[PDB]
């Protein structure tokens, strides 16, 4: 199994962009999708200030040059986890996008949780699911806030369970405990559709790449 | 299982320390990926603070030179009766045409705010746009 | 390559300046009985009432004229350190865009 590991699981980690996620987006695309639009200066969170380009007439503008790098890192991580056959769970309590997120999760062969988050799903999964249940290996937050503008309980729960998290963080969100935060607009439908498209594409490409690599290895 | 102290270090540091200490038999699936491609900031919990006294946010207001011109336009000719179409990425308002003409005359002429304003208005009427003060 | 600063500088939303009393073109994308959700290119949609005149013409995909009042409705209440947002824009529906 040493040869299997060294050629399949360790080889992708030696390349900067093994799945070519840099070509899935550009700053022009993010601008067209209105990813740079943030909330008012009054709703600003302190920890989001380093990601804010400025305030245009009291409206925060997100710096898309930073969004590009953060999104590159997040997409690369998501692709690598999909390559390793890890369980990926999307989470969002924005009801405007629940149907879209569940459809996207069904399409890429991953999991979604867009409904009410019951206490202990992660920290007490063993009682609520069974003694042998396998928890997610990665959790992607398309909206980190619940409907009260307080952080989703899943952020802290996944931090407790040592599960990495990707997260779309708007100017009023708290990015401290998200492993791979992506500053961006999480309200306009164009931006959310772009995020769903990108993550679906990355996961699908990673899975196809894994199958191709395994087939080639078996052949040779 | 790992440590559930989400406020001490980050998931990476906790998992790495437990792995070296022999508590965890095997690294989790994500550990190698994190080590190879870490985030720009280590995800460490921090408590947000309220600023007091002279401390101020470093967020600047986004202003441009042409804004000044725009202000005068919106104060003299008023908001254009034409509607903005923000969906078109290359939309040009009447104010934007006035700003472009103003900068053109300024670069091809002298610098006198009122003279540039009146000459630019005269020109824009010459191309044939209505401008009701 | 165009930098983000140039894109922001030449953006129509930036060119608009203040949003108070500006005429914009919005598109209806969702209807609930007599309630029209209109996107005009900002961060948030605006929720308007179906006018009593020619109300049948206001259907999904319809182009309407709006007079903006505020791009996002927020307000600070007593004993609060952060603004509360309704996640909505304020606009006045004028009519159909011919």
């Amino acid at each position: 199994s040493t040869d299997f590991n060294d050629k399949i699981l360790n080889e992708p980690l030696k390349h900067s962009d093994f799945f070519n996620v840099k070509e899935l987006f550009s700053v022009r695309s993010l601008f067209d999708a209105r990813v740079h639009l943030g909330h008012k200066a009054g709703c600003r969170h302190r920890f989001m200030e380093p990601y804010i380009f400025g305030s245009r007439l009291d409206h925060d503008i997100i710096d898309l040059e930073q969004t590009a790098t953060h999104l590159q890192l997040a997409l690369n991580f998501t692709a690598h986890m999909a390559y390793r056959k890890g369980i990926i769970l999307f989470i969002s309590r924005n009801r405007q996008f629940s149907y879209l997120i569940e459809n996207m999760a069904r399409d890429c062969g991953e999991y979604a949780h867009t409904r009410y988050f019951r206490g202990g799903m992660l920290t007490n999964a063993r009682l609520l699911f069974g003694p042998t249940v396998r928890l997610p290996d990665l959790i992607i937050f398309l909206h980190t806030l619940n409907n009260i503008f307080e952080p989703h309980v899943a952020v802290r729960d996944a931090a407790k369970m040592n599960i990495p998290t990707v997260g779309i963080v708007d100017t009023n969100c708290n990015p401290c405990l998200i492993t791979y935060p992506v500053p961006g607009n999480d309200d306009s439908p164009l931006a959310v559709h772009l995020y769903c498209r990108l993550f679906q594409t990355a996961i699908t490409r990673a899975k196809e790449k894994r199958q191709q690599v395994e087939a080639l290895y078996r052949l040779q | 299982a790992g440590s559930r102290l989400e406020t001490v270090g980050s998931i990476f540091s906790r998992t790495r320390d437990l792995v070296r200490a022999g508590v965890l038999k095997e690294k989790p699936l994500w550990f190698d990926v994190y080590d190879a491609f870490p985030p720009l900031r280590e995800p460490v919990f921090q408590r947000p603070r309220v600023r007091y006294g002279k401390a101020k946010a470093p967020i600047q207001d986004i202003w441009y030179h042409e804004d000044r011109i725009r202000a005068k336009f919106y104060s003299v000719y008023g908001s254009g009766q034409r509607a903005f179409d923000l969906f078109n990425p290359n939309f040009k308002s009447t104010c934007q045409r006035f700003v472009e003409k103003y900068t053109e005359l300024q670069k091809l002429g002298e610098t006198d705010e009122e003279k540039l304003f009146v000459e630019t208005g005269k020109a824009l009427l010459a191309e044939g746009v209505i401008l009701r003060r | 390559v165009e930098s983000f600063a140039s894109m922001l500088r030449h953006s129509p939303l930036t060119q608009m300046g203040p949003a108070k009393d500006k005429l914009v073109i919005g598109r209806i994308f969702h209807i609930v009985e007599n309630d029209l959700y209109i996107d005009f290119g900002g961060k948030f949609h605006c929720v308007c009432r179906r006018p009593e005149v020619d109300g049948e013409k206001y259907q999904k995909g319809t182009r309407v004229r709006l007079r903006l009042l505020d791009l996002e409705l927020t307000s600070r209440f007593l004993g609060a350190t952060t603004d509360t947002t309704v996640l909505e824009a304020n606009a006045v529906l004028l009519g159909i865009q011919e």
Partner: peptide, 25 residues
């Protein structure tokens, strides 16, 4: 790069309205 924002006072501010008797004795 010339496209960065510059520092200035808010140009979109209406100069304070003068009362009807301003400048009159």
């Amino acid at each position: 790069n010339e496209d960065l924002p510059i520092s200035m006072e808010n140009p979109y501010k209406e100069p304070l309205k003068k009362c009807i008797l301003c400048g009159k004795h």
